[PDB]
Amino acid sequence: AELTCTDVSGLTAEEIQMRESLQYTDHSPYPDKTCANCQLYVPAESPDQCGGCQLIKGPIHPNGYCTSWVQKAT
Ligand code: SF4
Incomplete structure (x- = not known):
């Protein structure tokens, strides 16, 4: 299974x-x-783990999004 970052049970x-x-x-x-x-x-420690924000x-997927997205691109 692909990496999922929807486990909010610690929050x-x-x-x-x-x-x-958001x-x-x-x-x-x-x-x-x-x-x-x-x-x-904030990238994960491994590409097989969720990052953060x-x-x-909670866990955050690099392919994810929220409406507060702040562009990196110059
Ligand atoms: S798009 Fe939203 S959830 Fe994703 S890193 Fe930016 S602020 Fe955090």
């Missing part, structure tokens, strides 16, 4: 609510906007 209800507010998804709807090209992403808590 508080309020932290989950923020993630939902429409976090593992599968970005946009070809050109993913967590991996967002300024707030400075803005929302």
